[PDB]
Ligand binder design. Structure first.
Ligand SMILES: CC[C@@H](c1ccccc1)c1c(O)c2c(oc1=O)CCCCCC2
Lengths: 99, 99
């Protein structure tokens, strides 16, 4: 597909079966979604950005269906205002920022 | 040009002549940079990042040169840890996200 930037690149993603609304963000180094349960085998992380830091729990190798493609990648859960898919997932998806 | 996102889409843009380094952000609606001092009309404003709020000054009708294309735009200045160009400028350039 081709996403125009006139609208927020918001898609529906299926992480381990659970349906989430995610914003595709090329400035996000990682991916952080809230409100999803992914197990009792995680790693405590801390990520910073504009305005401050946020504590997160990292889960590797997680099934992800988005844009009619399934990737296995690392995601972080935590109190974030909107669910973000950073570059770690976009590269795994084969996406590009074109001019 | 084409950005692969394996290494963070960062470029040099000139804001009314001053060169800065900015990250191309597809999730941000607005744009904010640290340090530039302009004179256009401005309004005090506060924004919310993925971790907290920051106090900004907002300028309108700002001449911006990026990737060899000139534009007239709205941008914000404040003590941000990372300079980003959001969708308001991205769209004026005609950039897109493909798969
Ligand atoms: C450039 C830093 C970036 C980021 C994202 C995730 C984790 C750390 C840093 C980031 C954005 O992409 C956006 C916003 O604030 C940010 O700090 C504004 C709020 C809305 C969310 C999308 C844009």
């Amino acid at each position: 597909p081709q996403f125009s930037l006139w609208k927020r690149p918001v898609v529906t993603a299926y992480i381990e079966g659970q349906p989430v609304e995610v914003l595709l963000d090329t400035g996000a180094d990682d991916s952080i979604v809230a409100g999803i349960e992914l197990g009792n085998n995680y790693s405590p992380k801390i990520v910073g950005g504009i305005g401050g830091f946020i504590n997160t729990l990292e889960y590797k190798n997680v099934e992800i269906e988005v844009l009619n493609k399934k990737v296995r990648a690392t995601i972080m859960t935590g109190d974030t205002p909107i669910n973000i898919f950073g570059r770690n997932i976009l590269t795994a998806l084969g996406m590009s920022l074109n001019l």
